[PDB]
Symmetry: C5
Subunit: 216 residues, 5 copies
């Protein structure tokens, strides 16, 4: 009857929308010098799980929020029964190649590979990860604690193709595990522009810097 149809319709609209987007001019070839893209990064640090002073590797668990905007993902909500956003497999759309620059093990993914696309063409994608990176935990057992840092950025695109930005320099600590072995003294996330004599193009990274110590 009445209510069952309205659900069948909204389903048809969504499937039509997804079809119109993923087939009509197929998956986007990535950014270029002529069509650059800005990716916004933010970290929500959940836990420093482990600090290994025999190999100088530290393990973090965090959510990496990524946001970007494509014209080719735009639609008029009016043409698709008032749909303003949708969930889709990350495999269905282009995603940026943001990588830790000093990891020592492949990143492990803790959350579904699904993204949210909005009618204005913005995508949001928020992978939870466990990362092992190069870090000397020396001083972790003192009042001053240890300090570690890891750069995140595109692996293959320069700043002429992908720019990075953060909404804030403060890493979100409001979900930090209250009973972690390590307590967080501060955690910052900072856009850096790197330059190199050989090369006209700039390189961009977000520098994640964590100061931590053993819980008392």
């Amino acid at each position: 009857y009445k209510d069952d149809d309205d659900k069948l319709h909204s389903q048809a609209n969504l499937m039509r929308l997804k079809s119109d987007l993923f087939n009509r001019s197929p998956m986007y070839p990535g950014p270029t010098k002529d069509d650059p893209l800005t990716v916004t990064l933010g970290f929500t640090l959940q836990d420093i799980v482990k600090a290994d002073s025999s190999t100088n590797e530290v393990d973090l668990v965090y959510y990496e929020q990524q946001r970007w905007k494509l014209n080719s993902l735009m639609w008029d909500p009016n043409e698709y029964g008032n749909i303003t956003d949708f969930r889709t497999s990350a495999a269905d759309i282009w995603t940026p190649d943001i990588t830790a620059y000093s990891s020592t093990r492949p990143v492990q993914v803790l959350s579904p590979q699904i993204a949210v696309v909005t009618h204005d063409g913005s995508v949001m994608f928020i992978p939870a990860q466990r990362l092992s990176f190069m870090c000397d935990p020396t001083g972790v057992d003192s009042e001053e604690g240890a300090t570690c840092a890891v750069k995140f950025g595109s692996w293959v695109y320069s700043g002429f193709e992908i720019d990075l930005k953060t909404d804030t320099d403060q890493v979100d600590l409001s979900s930090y595990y209250a009973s972690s072995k390590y307590e967080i003294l501060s955690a910052t996330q900072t856009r850096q522009v790197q330059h190199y004599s050989c090369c006209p193009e700039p390189y961009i990274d977000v520098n994640l810097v964590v100061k931590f110590r053993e819980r008392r």
Copy 2:
């Protein structure tokens, strides 16, 4: 008698065909879905006090209902349900919110679909999650908690419920290193600052201690 079997097979293959490779984009605000969760806690395998991670093995029972998976048993030679690869159908993205390692899957990825459109899927998992086992060697024991919920859908798209707050303990390993004092599973609604959309999770809370002498 060999024919009756060939027929029931044909009906099942036709049904599966009519459902999958002829006819789901997931739930929406306009077409929301309710997932029922239940845990059967098999074993606390390991409690690592140097990293504060605990390892659990459990069965996660998931249940939901799709109109698009309905059929009339009469049209398909009285078939009322069938077994199918979980890869063949949409499944919910229920995730542990505080895991520290990817979940490991211990059982086949197979689901049961019923003529009324309900699906049941029951993955066995091993999970490492954030937990301070301090006190696990005392009479009071330790307490740990982990939220499970959709990763990408708010409570306008996916609602969660439990049939019961008591975690099923009747398959708990009698000789585990740890004994279970209590295990509850509770639907929580977090509201927020800004936002109008409520978020739903199921909070798994386990009280446990070292098994005695």
Copy 3:
């Protein structure tokens, strides 16, 4: 050289006729199946008394029979059986009920199909399961048990049977850290109050101790 090209053609035709033409959806209440299980225990590799997990390595022999896999050897140049990738045919979802890590596969995923419709498939596996090794260092030794059965089919869909209650120990590693006192494999039938179907498993029970 022709004799060989012919027998090849016949085999490829047979496989074609069976797989790419005529479609097995698994067993049902109306078309139930019997799987025969047997274990050959190769080694107890490791017993961890800090987590109560034991690691076994064994061969799990699985056998079943499908009408849809039958052929007349006469129509296919006297072929009576063939080897095929396990990915090419339906296989049962036999699982350990108390494993603590995903099972690791030690052998090729290949099965043997016979003209009468029977399949035999014998994965070698390493399994970690829930087990208290307490007493392993005593004359009496430890005892551990693990049920194996279908994960999603009740006994109305898949019955289980064993040819024998004795686990095959004739390939047990003579120099394992642990010696086997006994190892049995037993069909069990179970009801639960949720459901009206019988449920069926094969219970593998191993008694072992530290090698002297």
Copy 4:
């Protein structure tokens, strides 16, 4: 110049096409048996665990066989005598360690060399954990361990095995390994079991080793 390269490319792609289509090999049979030649090049005994009695080896396993269905006349394909191809593109034998304790790990690309006469050569580098008591490793006499390699599903009526030599190649053994090799042999064995009327073949790899001084 540039054309003679485009041509040799076209010839190779045509050859590969002509082979992997036009009669797309079902494996050996009683009527069409096959001989696989095995050889090991032992690179390193990495680890010897006396608490679980497992030893880790790294070696190259050379495999060689010959299929009529892989033959071609070099004259018909611009004088191509051999080519490199993904192992996934052709049938390969199911040679397994009979007493491994972990899945084999593959250290090298899964690529094989096919020659106009129909012969294939495939040389996977592997790390293997297998059952072995390292007792005595720390004495002048050292330890001895053994592992059989053979087909998992084919009897000796379908696959015969042979070695070109009984001596395992030791010329790439890591000079600074924790363990030095006293001897390493590879031997064809023919077995009979009473389950069965057909013979079974393996190559038994026997290693005698001790701690480096």
Copy 5:
């Protein structure tokens, strides 16, 4: 300038289409169509040295470069595109392997490559590698020395030649706070002939001298 962007996208998708179809799949190099791969290492960190198994763990970037005629295009025909990024699975890549690894290589970076209009490809996987190495002496002033050959697994030097732009491993990204400090790191092209075989074999030999940080 919404149209400009749609056009440059169309051009790129057309180019990628024209390349990955029409004469589909380059079949790899041959005696008649040999290829030169250029290797370079950027050593990031010696992570671990295990003296109980004689395995050392390295983390490095392996730069690989080669050139295919079949990847060439005229930038003029494709709206002035001079290069593009593509999934490494979309194109042939060389089978460069460590000859004395003890565990499968672990990949730390996206499997993406850069193709340029002149037909050259660049691909720079970050890896963690465990290889056979006796760290004896690491705790002395002289330190330890280890070596690992890298080369094609299945192609002789008649099919794949290797070369380096420089003998010096790039150390400018070496982790300042690694447990181990680098005394020197060289990367050297070697040519081998054998008795088994009239073909020449080429490998690049990575040699690292290192010791415990003080």
